[PDB]
Design a protein around this ligand. Structure first.
Ligand SMILES: Cn1ncc(C(=O)NCc2cc[nH]n2)c1C(=O)Nc1ccn2cc(-c3ccccc3)nc2n1
Ligand SMILES: [Mg+2]
Ligand SMILES: [Zn+2]
Length: 313
């Protein structure tokens, strides 16, 4: 009960900034997460014995894929931690509890392939879940780990609070399906502009938590240029592996997934920033002004990709 986690001074400070990189020392990532829960949520939120056992079971159910791995889970949780610490009073106790867990669990048992590839492969998960295929599986794996003896970190909630927290987690993890992001952002765009956006309307909060999830999930593009650029190799390692598996099923993949078209990555990253990432953090910054450092870092990285295209890197 009187047992804080405490990080070294450089991490104690930098962990508060949106652009913090959790480092290459895997054995520090559990303590980084517990640190973030204790400051976001309280030392009372979870039984440490149970939390520690839930964290290690979650870690074990992430695979050693180049991008959708345990490091991504912890990175996406740290971005959520930063959004919550910069928007103290906008979020319920339950919401802070559920969102840090949802971010940690959001890509559980990812295999490094998209929903599209599962459907073209005719994977069993595509018969069980016809839309948001991986995301419905990530939520399923979250509930399975919650039900392991010793792992129920929510056991001290009332029955109704327990149902609300699992419902926050389920919607948060489904919202990480980027196919749903485009419509969720448009609707938040219209509601903010026409002035109907109302954070006491549950269906409105849901949409806002959905956009926060998309912002956390895409947060590679909000790091300092050297982090963003070196991790871009991890995401293309997966895309191009999926492209190779497309060609083995007799299907030309899209260019993003075709390693023969590596040359056009710079222009492909431009599209992504322009069509997805900049719109995401713009609409987030309109709803939650203290998240503006994410939009500023995203814009800095777009401008670094523009320099790549102009032959200056
Ligand atoms: C979903 N998702 N999640 C994260 C990212 C990502 O690219 N994140 C940046 C990142 C990750 C780490 N550092 N930077 C994306 C994404 O769809 N990107 C994308 C989206 C569209 N494209 C198109 C091309 C491309 C490349 C070569 C030739 C032709 C076209 N290239 C892309 N790339
Ligand atoms: Mg995912
Ligand atoms: Zn993810």
């Amino acid at each position: 009960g009187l047992m804080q986690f405490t990080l070294p001074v450089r991490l104690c400070k930098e962990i508060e900034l949106f652009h913090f990189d959790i480092g290459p020392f895997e054995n520090m990532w559990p303590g980084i997460f517990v640190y973030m829960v204790h400051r976001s949520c309280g030392t009372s939120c979870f039984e440490l014995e149970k939390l520690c056992r839930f964290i290690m079971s979650v870690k074990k159910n992430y695979r050693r894929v180049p991008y959708h791995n345990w490091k991504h889970a912890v990175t996406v949780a740290h971005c959520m931690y930063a959004i919550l610490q910069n928007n103290h009073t906008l979020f319920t106790d339950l919401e802070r509890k559920g969102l840090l867990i949802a971010c940690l669990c959001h890509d559980l048992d990812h295999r490094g392939f998209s929903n599209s590839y599962l459907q073209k492969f005719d994977h069993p998960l595509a018969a069980l879940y016809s839309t948001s295929t991986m995301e419905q599986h990530h939520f399923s794996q979250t509930v399975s780990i919650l039900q392991l003896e010793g792992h129920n970190i929510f056991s001290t909630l009332s029955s109704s609070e327990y149902e609300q927290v699992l419902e926050i987690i389920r919607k948060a993890i489904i919202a990480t399906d980027l196919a749903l992001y485009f419509g969720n952002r448009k609707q938040l765009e219209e509601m903010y502009q026409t002035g109907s956006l109302n954070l006491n309307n549950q269906s409105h909060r849901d949409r806002v938590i959905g956009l926060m999830m998309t912002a956390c999930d895409l947060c590679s593009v909000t790091k300092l240029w050297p982090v963003t650029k070196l991790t871009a190799n991890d995401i293309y390692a997966e895309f191009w592996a999926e492209g190779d598996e497309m060609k083995k099923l007799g299907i030309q993949p899209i260019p993003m997934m075709d390693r023969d078209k590596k040359d056009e990555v710079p222009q492909g990253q431009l599209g992504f920033y322009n069509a997805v990432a900049i719109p995401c953090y713009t609409t987030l910054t309109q709803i939650l002004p203290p998240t503006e450092p994410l939009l500023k870092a995203c814009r800095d990285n777009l401008s670094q990709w523009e320099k790549v295209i102009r032959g200056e890197e």
